[PDB]
Design a protein around this ligand. Structure first.
Ligand code: PC1
Ligand code: PC1
Ligand code: PC1
Ligand code: 3PE
Ligand code: 3PE
Ligand code: 3PE
Lengths: 318, 112, 96, 96, 172, 111, 69, 80, 71, 344
């Protein structure tokens, strides 16, 4: 029945990414002093069944000027590498056990931006043309900030797999010891996935609407359901790579219970920001990475290398 | 043998869902006029995409810092050895060979 | 012209990765490992110009350890001793 | 066995009319930067199916230049089509 | 999911190439690679070498190609028609595709034909393993990390890259 | 080539799972060492594990009476000991640490 | 302030399924014992052995001490 | 020169935190005696299988029974 | 102990893949019973094609590819 | 800028020192893989629309030239699986070595290149550095030396010293005339190579000097043949007796040293009782001389001094070590039966 363990995953998650869109504007509602979608629910909890159905009724135009062969294979992705990445992710028991799999995320973190470059180019001119070009450029310069500061800690835990990374955070919430890094693990995923303070990719201010501009109701649910299938995953990751829970070979169930009451707090962070801060004006946006974020990330790497060796600490792995 | 069962499962929901959205009302009987009114709010736009350089280097500039952090990758497996000094003395070279390669270019980024 | 400095003074530039049997850090072998220490033992004090017409035996099987070139043919030729006669008797084996 | 004749027919990707030509140089330079993987994979098996255990890094060093260098020679292809806007191998000017 | 799941990848790989080994309007050139690179990193993930496979995604297919694709907006081709554009690409294709096919047809369509294509048997993966073994990180490229014995191999590559930028800080 | 017949085969293999086989496994070898180290030297010292089959039946033998020993005195603490370690994944040794004494109560003591 | 307390309870539970599904399929498919894991070729080597000796074909049925008497 | 070192720390206090950690990780591995413990532990982990040597005459040490007095003390770690 | 179980499993395995070969056919243009593809004489660990014949059904597929792609 | 130009210009020879010093096929890849990486910026310096349509016709012609080699390294990693550096153990290796390595040297074919680069590199300064790349490859061929199909390395030779000869008789630009007849002297040294491979180097050093001392002379302003006419009545006549004391010696006549390689080489190529080969080489370098005559009828015949051209100033170039070489490029014949027993 291994095929019914899968399809029990893909389906029950599409409800979260659906019902996030509701808690989008309730939480961001009371920052403003008001209430959130209310009239339709009664509580509102019934809103997203009505919204999923307005789009696919609503007619899906294509530009007369487009290349239809690319205008499909691209979105036929924004929903794969979002739903594949979930596969080897322990909670506690991952569906797959990949030996070195931690590295496998970067494989699928790196291969999504090659679905932006298609779509914005697939269609047409300068609002999605050079406007989907220069959100490529920022999306690849926030990896080098990443793979390093992912690679740092992994000196402090011994291997590339995720079954060890529950063992080492036992009674030490891995955020003490590298708290300088942890910050930069946060501003990255918020800068890379195109969210609030570095917002530019999806346009509001700097342009009209980035990269979404052409898709009518028909395809544009996918992206608007793809872009929220990354955001609740990196944030359902960070908390396996920092704030660890305590496995329990007996009541596995109490592992996940206490696990979603963390990863679900953590997420409610990209909403708790977006009410707050303004945007960066694309110069300042990269111009603050090389100069500023990076020099440290190298420097710390020269540090977490020696700290095990200089304490006879060297973590028990191959 | 069950990985590919967990991949082609995933696409086939996605490669399905394009047609049941894009295609299904696409053959609907509504008007859908062929008028060249599309390509919103930059009506005509006749040009080649000109070369704009400081767009370009931020490609190259990365690609090279990229390589060696593949070279740099097998530290945590190499922390288990016999003679370890040839590591710390050597490991710390790559980094400084990376960080140097900054400082030079750092005289000119331009507007990045 | 091949100077061979690493002979004169002390350093090792490469000389380690060179052949199929040297170290292998945890001491783990190759498959055809045992035929190296056999074949190098042959031509060393030789000047290699008579090697080709001298040793050649300890070399050939070594080339036939490596690729399994023949044993795969005498094998593929059991598929012609059986599996043309399947209907003509001796199913071979009895399962199990 | 068979996987050594594929990939090999793949490493005749050279095919040279399509190595320098015809225009859109970027197609030529492309089949070059993918002439690797015929060098890589082919050398990621022979190293692997027999346990060398040592040359195993070599596959890594076959990229680290193949990306480093082939990414250089991209640069010129800006200088050509900076002053033009079309690469078009059909620029001959320096003659003989 | 038979024993032939390797032979079915490569002959897709070998067909991965001939797409861009002719003349496809090189915004589809990429789509001749990331399939070929993908299936390529596919084949390698058998045989037991893994780490060394999963890198090609990270360092090349993921990282490199995007630069190859981040340009061809700077060299940007004209919007003449692209792909099926000019009536010429199609002529060169098939004769390649059949040339392995007609090869693959009677290479072995029978007992043997004849000699040079007859010394390759098929179907059990005769060589593809040996015996059993112990474990070190796996056995094979599990230990690919030598900052021990390898040094004069790194320090050239370590130094040869550092000059990569200086050359390119100029002509730029 | 010469291969021995089909005979001196079909011998008594210790048939147990891989969880119990690592249960004791520890008191096991440290105290025996009568054939086994010696049996290595009939392999490493001279290869071709064909010419040397003999101690193979000695080293296989030592196990037989070992598990046949333990069944007589105390199988009750053992049976319960290799249950926990058989409660599974990775077969850690740091979960059953408590019960490690109950198995080893009189084994190091009685016999 | 309260009206958002229901909004969570949809998303929250919908992530408490996929963690209890896989956990209780493995425990159910192998009958009470968590799934084995083979990282290193030695570790595998005992399962593919244990399949042979178990009762028929599977790795999850252990014989025990009385098996060999 | 200390007026300099305080007049770059009123302007760019960023990379200074990298240099401050750039060294101070290079220097220390040659100091604290905890190290070189690190090289002893890491040598003694038996990845491989020990093969017993042949004993004719000496046999310096290391009898047949392992727990008998044989060889060095690795149990300075167990107490550690 | 663990190994002294295997070496017997292959020598048992060759014999049946020989004794049940030599009784398939004895052909006049055939092969001698159990010759050597080499000249040299000692025990060299056999290739997968030696242990399992053209049998090639399933339990092979769970042997060579058994470890890779999954528990 | 000025520091690095000595960092780059140093790394070249470090690119070719790992070539001559190594045991290990990988390094002779990396070794002359980082020339095609470290040569390229030198071409540039004045950033013109030739060098950049030059070094790009150079680049991809030394890109594959390398990248085939790596295919003929990894063949005999299959067979014999022993790297190092020795005969190649398999014929598809060597035939894919030597006739894909002739690309860097370029031999009889594989030169539509040497005139397309050497011409119209805006930088004539040097362009003396294209005497390194003759010296990297040979330091393989001396090692692999006892494996060649032997019907080839002559067949690229004898189709070379011919084809590089006729190439120039039709030429005027004198960067080309050196470009041509530098395929020629690649005809003598790899025609010998299977017979007694020293008495090759002999021709290799005598070559590095003579072509060297040309350029250093061609550096004052000199470019086109008819700018070497305005030479003797303008710059200095002691220059003209020089350019006539070499260009003649370089095709060679016995009282000079240019006759030194042939005179020795044929001691070798007969005594192996091949006497029908060397005449045709010996006789073909003849019409390799008729460039130089008719080059040398430019400067001693006082041909129409340029125009009113008054250079009253003295010189400040770097003649460095030119005040030596044409006492060693000429007068050394009387000296040496050393060269066969000295480098050996
Ligand atoms: C070279 C000494 C290194 C070892 C020193 C031992 C550590 C002990 C404590 C050192 C105290 C600080 C020493 C000098 C600090 C430098 C002050 C300064 O102005 O230089 C920055 C100078 C001032 O440059 P600037 O004037 O152009 O200001 C720009 C500064 N940012 C980048 C913040 C905008 O800038 C640099 O050139 C630094 C670029 C090199 C980046 C290397 C990053 C570190 C990589 C790890 C190594
Ligand atoms: C010094 C060893 C480490 C080298 C790292 C690379 C440069 C690190 C810079 C660290 C901080 C330098 C402070 C600002 C730069 C110095 C400004 C100055 O005094 O100008 C005098 C100048 C520095 O000028 P500049 O580099 O600041 O900018 C001027 C631009 N050029 C170089 C074209 C003139 O002194 C030099 O010319 C020395 C540098 C030569 C070329 C630079 C690369 C080679 C470095 C030498 C090896
Ligand atoms: C021998 C090993 C290989 C050597 C072959 C040639 C090496 C030349 C390297 C530098 C040449 C150069 O670029 O100089 C140009 C430069 C001129 O370049 P420039 O005029 O364009 O601009 C100069 C710019 N700065 C100021 C930065 C230098 O120098 C000269 O004018 C003199 C030419 C060099 C003279 C040749 C040196 C050796 C000559 C005889 C060789 C004898 C070999 C021994 C035989 C046995
Ligand atoms: C648009 C519609 C048309 C497209 C439809 C099809 C799209 C397919 C796209 C493929 C994208 C995902 C491919 C990524 C491959 C990743 C494989 C991987 O990393 O698996 C990890 C694992 C490592 O093995 P390890 O854990 O170390 O050892 C276990 C020991 N028991 O590895 C293993 O366990 C063994 C590997 C088993 C899997 C076999 C190989 C699978 C990969 C083949 C991909 C083919 C490429 C397809 C195109 C890719 C384009 C992006
Ligand atoms: C007494 C020296 C000659 C008389 C004075 C020299 C006048 C002079 O400077 O001319 C040098 C002359 C070059 O000849 P040219 O260039 O054609 O004529 C115009 C130059 N004013 O001729 C030269 O001097 C060029 C140098 C050529 C080699 C030196 C020979 C000069 C003769 C004097 C030294 C001779 C030493 C050897 C003597 C025996 C000869 C083997
Ligand atoms: C024949 C026997 C074979 C062995 C030959 C040995 C080399 C002979 C050594 C003397 C070479 C002379 C020389 O180096 O160049 C001449 C001149 C320097 O002469 P100098 O006395 O220093 O006058 C300085 C006035 N400013 O220099 C100049 O003209 C310009 C200044 C540059 C100085 C260069 C110094 C180089 C010294 C070593 C050169 C080695 C390379 C020689 C090239 C040919 C080698 C075959």
């Amino acid at each position: 029945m291994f095929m019914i363990n899968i399809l029990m995953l893909i389906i029950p998650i599409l409800l979260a990414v659906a019902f996030l869109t509701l808690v989008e504007r309730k939480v961001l509602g009371y920052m403003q002093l008001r209430k959130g979608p209310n009239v339709v629910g009664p509580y509102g909890l019934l809103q997203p069944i009505a919204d999923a159905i307005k789009l696919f009724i609503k007619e899906p135009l294509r530009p007369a000027t487009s290349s239809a062969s690319m205008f499909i294979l691209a979105p036929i992705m924004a929903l794969g590498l979002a739903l594949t990445m979930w596969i080897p992710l322990p909670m506690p028991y991952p569906l797959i056990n990949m030996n070195l799999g931690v590295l496998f995320m970067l494989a699928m973190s790196s291969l999504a931006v090659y679905s932006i470059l298609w779509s914005g180019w697939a269609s047409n001119s300068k609002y999605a043309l050079i406007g989907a070009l220069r959100a490529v450029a920022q999306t690849i310069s926030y990896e080098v900030t990443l793979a390093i500061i992912l690679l740092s800690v992994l000196l402090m835990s011994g291997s590339f797999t995720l079954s060890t990374l529950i063992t080492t955070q036992e009674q030490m919430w891995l955020i003490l010891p590298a708290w300088p890094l942890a910050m930069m693990w946060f501003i990255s995923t918020l800068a890379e996935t195109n969210r609030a303070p570095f917002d530019l990719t999806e346009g509001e201010s700097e342009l009209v609407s980035g990269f979404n501009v052409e898709y009518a109701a028909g395809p544009f649910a996918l992206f608007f359901m793809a872009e929220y299938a990354n955001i609740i995953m990196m944030n359902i990751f960070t908390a396996i790579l920092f704030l660890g829970t305590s496995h329990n070979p007996h009541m596995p169930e109490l592992y996940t219970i206490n696990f979603t009451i963390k990863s679900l707090l953590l997420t409610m962070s990209f909403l708790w920001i977006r009410a707050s801060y303004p945007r960066f004006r694309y110069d300042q946006l990269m111009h603050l990475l090389w100069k500023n974020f990076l020099p440290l990330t190298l420097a710390l790497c020269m540090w977490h290398v020696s700290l095990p060796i200089l304490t006879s600490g060297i973590p028990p792995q191959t | 043998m069950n990985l590919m069962l967990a991949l082609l499962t995933n696409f086939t929901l996605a490669t399905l869902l394009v047609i049941i959205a894009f295609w299904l009302p696409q053959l609907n009987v509504y008007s859908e006029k062929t008028s060249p009114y599309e390509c919103g709010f930059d009506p005509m736009g006749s040009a080649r995409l000109p070369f704009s350089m400081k767009f370009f280097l931020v490609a190259i500039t990365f690609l090279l810092f990229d390589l060696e952090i593949a070279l740099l990758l097998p530290l945590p497996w190499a922390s288990q050895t016999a003679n370890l000094n040839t590591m710390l003395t050597m490991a710390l070279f790559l980094i400084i060979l990376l960080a140097v390669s900054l400082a030079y270019e750092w005289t000119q980024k331009g507007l990045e | 012209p091949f100077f061979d400095v690493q002979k004169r003074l002390g350093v090792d530039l490469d000389r380690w990765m060179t052949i199929q049997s040297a170290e292998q850090p945890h001491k783990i072998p190759s498959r055809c490992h045992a035929f190296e220490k056999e074949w190098i033992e042959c031509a060393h004090g030789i000047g290699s110009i008579r090697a080709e017409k001298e040793c050649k035996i300890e070399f050939e099987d070594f080339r036939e350890c490596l690729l399994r070139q023949k044993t795969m043919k005498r094998l593929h030729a059991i598929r012609r001793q059986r599996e043309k006669l399947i209907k003509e008797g001796k199913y071979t084996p009895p399962p199990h | 066995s068979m996987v050594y004749m594929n990939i090999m027919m793949a490493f005749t990707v050279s095919l040279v009319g399509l190595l320098m030509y015809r225009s859109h140089l970027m197609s030529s330079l492309l089949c070059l930067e993918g002439m690797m993987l015929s060098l890589f994979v082919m050398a990621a098996l022979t190293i692997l199916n027999s346990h060398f255990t040592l040359a195993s890094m070599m596959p890594i060093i076959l990229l680290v230049f193949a990306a480093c260098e082939a990414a250089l020679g991209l640069s010129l292809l800006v200088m050509v089509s900076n002053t033009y806007g079309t690469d078009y191998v059909q620029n001959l000017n320096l003659l003989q | 999911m038979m024993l032939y799941i390797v032979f079915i990848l490569s002959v897709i790989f070998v067909m991965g190439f001939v797409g861009f080994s002719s003349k496809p309007s090189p915004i589809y050139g990429g789509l001749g690679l990331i399939v070929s690179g993908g299936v390529g990193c596919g084949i390698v993930l058998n045989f037991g070498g893994s780490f060394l496979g999963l890198m090609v995604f990270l360092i090349y297919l993921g990282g490199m190609m995007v630069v190859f694709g981040y340009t061809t907006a700077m060299a940007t081709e004209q919007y003449p028609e692209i792909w099926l554009s000019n009536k010429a690409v199609l002529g060169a294709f098939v004769t390649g595709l059949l040339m392995e096919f007609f090869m693959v047809y009677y290479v072995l369509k029978d007992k043997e034909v004849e000699v040079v294509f007859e010394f390759n048997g098929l179907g059990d993966w005769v060589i593809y393993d040996t015996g059993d073994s112990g474990f070190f990180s796996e056995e094979a490229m599990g230990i690919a990390a030598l900052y021990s014995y390898g040094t004069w191999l790194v320090i050239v590559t370590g130094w040869s890259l550092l000059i990569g930028v200086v050359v390119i800080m100029e002509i730029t | 080539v010469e291969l021995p017949s089909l005979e001196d085969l079909k011998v008594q293999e210790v048939k147990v799972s891989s969880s119990v086989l690592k249960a004791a496994a520890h008191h096991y070898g440290a105290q025996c060492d009568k054939p086994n180290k010696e049996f290595m030297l009939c392999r490493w010292e001279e290869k071709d594990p064909r010419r040397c089959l003999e101690e193979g039946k000695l080293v296989n033998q030592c196990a037989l009476e070992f598990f046949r020993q333990i069944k007589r005195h105390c199988a009750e603490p053992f049976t319960e000991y290799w249950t926990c370690i058989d409660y599974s994944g990775l077969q850690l040794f740091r979960r059953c640490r408590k019960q490690q004494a109950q198995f080893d109560e009189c084994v190091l003591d009685k016999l | 302030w309260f009206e958002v307390l229901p909004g969570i309870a949809v998303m929250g539970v919908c992530l408490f399924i996929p963690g209890m599904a896989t956990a209780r399929i493995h425990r159910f498919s192998n009958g009470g014992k968590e799934k084995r894991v083979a990282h290193y070729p030695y570790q595998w080597y005992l399962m593919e052995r244990d399949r042979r000796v178990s009762g028929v074909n599977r790795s999850y049925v252990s014989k025990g001490l009385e098996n060999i008497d | 020169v200390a007026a300099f070192l305080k007049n770059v720390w009123a302007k760019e206090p960023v990379l200074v935190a990298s240099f401050a950690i750039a060294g101070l990780a290079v220097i220390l591995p040659t100091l604290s005696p905890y190290t070189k413990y690190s090289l002893m532990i890491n040598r003694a982990t038996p990845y491989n299988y020990p093969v017993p040597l042949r004993d004719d005459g000496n046999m310096p040490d290391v009898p047949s029974h392992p727990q008998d007095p044989q060889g060095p003390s690795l149990e300075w770690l167990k107490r550690l | 102990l663990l190994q002294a179980e295997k070496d017997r499993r292959v020598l048992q395995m060759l014999r049946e893949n020989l004794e049940e070969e030599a009784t398939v056919m004895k052909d006049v243009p055939g092969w001698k019973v159990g010759e050597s593809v080499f000249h040299t004489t000692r025990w060299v660990t056999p290739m997968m094609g030696e242990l399992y014949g053209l049998r090639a059904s399933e339990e092979v597929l769970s042997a060579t590819y058994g470890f890779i792609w999954y528990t | 800028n000025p520091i690095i130009f000595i960092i780059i210009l140093l790394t070249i020879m470090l690119g070719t020192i790992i070539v001559m010093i190594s045991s290990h096929w990988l390094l002779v890849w990396i070794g002359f893989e980082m020339n095609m990486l470290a040569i390229i910026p030198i071409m540039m310096k004045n950033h013109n629309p030739r060098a950049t349509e030059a070094s790009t016709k150079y680049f991809l012609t030394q890109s594959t030239a390398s990248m085939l080699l790596m295919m003929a390294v990894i063949i005999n990693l299959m067979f014999s699986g022993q790297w190092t550096v020795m005969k190649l153990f398999n014929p598809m290796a060597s035939m894919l070595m030597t006739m894909a390595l002739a690309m860097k040297l370029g031999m009889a074919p594989f030169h539509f290149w040497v005139p397309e680069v050497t011409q119209g590199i805006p930088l004539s300064s040097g362009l003396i550095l294209l005497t390194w790349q003759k010296l990297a490859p040979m330091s393989v061929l001396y090692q692999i030396f006892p494996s060649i199909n032997l019907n080839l390395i002559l067949t690229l030779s004898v189709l070379s010293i011919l084809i590089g000869g006729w190439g120039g008789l039709n030429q005027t630009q004198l960067r080309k005339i050196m470009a041509y007849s530098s395929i020629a002297h690649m005809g003598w040294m790899t025609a010998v190579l299977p017979y007694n491979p020293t008495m090759t180097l002999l021709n290799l050093i005598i070559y590095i000097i003579m072509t060297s001392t040309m350029f250093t002379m061609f550096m004052a302003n000199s470019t086109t043949t008819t700018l070497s006419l305005s030479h003797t009545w303008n710059k200095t006549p002691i220059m003209t007796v020089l350019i006539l004391a070499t260009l003649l010696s370089m095709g060679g006549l016995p009282p000079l040293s240019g006759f030194m390689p042939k005179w020795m080489i044929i001691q070798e190529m007969t005594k192996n009782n091949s006497i029908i080969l060397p005449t045709f080489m010996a006789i073909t370098a003849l019409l390799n001389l008729y460039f130089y005559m008719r080059l040398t009828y430019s400067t001693t015949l006082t041909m129409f001094p340029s125009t009113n051209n008054m250079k009253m100033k003295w010189q400040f170039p770097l003649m460095k070590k030119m005040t030596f070489l044409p006492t060693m490029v000429v007068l050394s014949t009387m000296m040496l039966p050393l060269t066969p027993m000295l480098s050996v």
